[PDB]
Amino acid sequence: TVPWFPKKISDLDHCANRVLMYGGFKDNVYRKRRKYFADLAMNYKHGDPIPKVEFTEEEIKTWGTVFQELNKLYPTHACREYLKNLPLLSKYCGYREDNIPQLEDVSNFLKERTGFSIRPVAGYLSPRDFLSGLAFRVFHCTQYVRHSSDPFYTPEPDTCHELLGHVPLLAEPSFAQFSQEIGLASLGASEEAVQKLATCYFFTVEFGLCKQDGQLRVFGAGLLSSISELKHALSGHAKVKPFDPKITCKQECLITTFQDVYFVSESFEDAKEKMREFTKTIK
Numbered sequence: 001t002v003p004w005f006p007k008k009i010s011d012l013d014h015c016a017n018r019v020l021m022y023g024g025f026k027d028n029v030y031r032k033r034r035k036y037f038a039d040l041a042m043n044y045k046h047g048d049p050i051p052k053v054e055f056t057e058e059e060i061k062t063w064g065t066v067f068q069e070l071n072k073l074y075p076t077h078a079c080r081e082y083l084k085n086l087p088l089l090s091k092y093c094g095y096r097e098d099n100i101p102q103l104e105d106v107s108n109f110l111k112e113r114t115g116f117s118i119r120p121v122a123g124y125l126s127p128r129d130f131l132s133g134l135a136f137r138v139f140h141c142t143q144y145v146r147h148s149s150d151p152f153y154t155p156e157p158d159t160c161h162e163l164l165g166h167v168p169l170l171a172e173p174s175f176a177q178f179s180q181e182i183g184l185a186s187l188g189a190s191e192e193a194v195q196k197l198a199t200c201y202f203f204t205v206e207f208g209l210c211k212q213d214g215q216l217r218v219f220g221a222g223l224l225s226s227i228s229e230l231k232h233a234l235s236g237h238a239k240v241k242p243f244d245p246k247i248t249c250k251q252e253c254l255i256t257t258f259q260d261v262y263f264v265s266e267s268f269e270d271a272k273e274k275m276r277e278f279t280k281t282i283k
């Protein structure tokens with residue numbers, strides 16, 4: 001027997017609500033605001049335009065802080081693919097210090113560039129359900145903004161993380177392929193296989209480094225959206241190892257701290273080839 005998995009993009013309607021939600025913990029205004037976003041995600045069905053949100057002034061200020069500081073780091077810290085796509089997003093999707101891009105606009109942009117699209121999501125999906133989205137080039141994205149007290153690092157994914165961390169690499173064909181292949185490999189796989197695939201995803205897509213012209217750069221979205229961890233990953237204080245799926249899949253994923261190790265890939269093409277070799281051995 002194989003567990004249920006989606007067979008078409010609309011089938012994601014059936015898992016995308018199977019979510020662990022928030023529950024700032026004591027802030028009534030923050031909570032109400034978080035409920036508003038969760039409900040927009042819960043009521044979403046494939047085919048809908050993604051609701052456009054009027055962000056508050058404080059939400060926009062938190063975005064601006066994050067945007068401003070990160071943009072000072074990307075030239076020296078981000079991989080070339082990231083920096084190639086970031087200007088196109090400014091131009092077409094309204095990435096500016098004073099404006100939070102809408103998921104709808106970014107979804108349309110990605111659909112033209114790599115066939116990627118966005119679905120809003122209320123909170124954390126299982127690794128299984130999250131990965132299954134990537135199989136159809138669907139990236140589940142949070143829509144709320146991180147609490148204003150922690151602009152530099154948050155343990156929870158927010159819309160800043162999705163927009164600044166993930167989107168610019170989803171716009172890159174080799175990366176989109178890489179991601180989709182993790183998804184495809186996950187469909188109907190065993191729990192053990194999903195866990196391995198999810199860890200490899202975590203140490204590439206979320207926290208990966210790559211070597212470009214001899215220097216370390218970042219492609220991990222969890223690094224690209226955290227001012228403090230981005231600095232930390234290239235500071236010389238972090239432990240780094242070669243990306244190697246059979247090893248990297250055993251690494252524990254840390255949740256409320258900086259990671260204890262970053263994996264370095266040679267290129268998106270090479271990481272993809274490495275995952276292809278690996279997936280054979282767990283099917």
Ligand SMILES: Nc1nc(O[C@H](c2ccc(Cl)cc2-c2ccccc2)C(F)(F)F)cc(N2CCC3(CC2)CN[C@H](C(=O)O)C3)n1
Pocket residue numbers: 020124125126127130131152153154155156157158160161198199201202206221222223225226227253254255
């Ligand atoms: N994928 C991912 N995963 C997280 O959690 C894991 C996970 C948890 C729960 C569930 Cl239900 C699933 C996963 C799970 C789901 C997809 C695949 C594999 C693992 C795990 F705990 F395993 F590590 C946290 C996270 N974040 C946290 C928030 C930041 C991005 C990374 C870190 N700092 C950034 C910033 O400051 O901008 C934002 N990303």
Ligand SMILES: [Fe+3]
Pocket residue numbers: 157161165166206221222
């Ligand atoms: Fe992420």
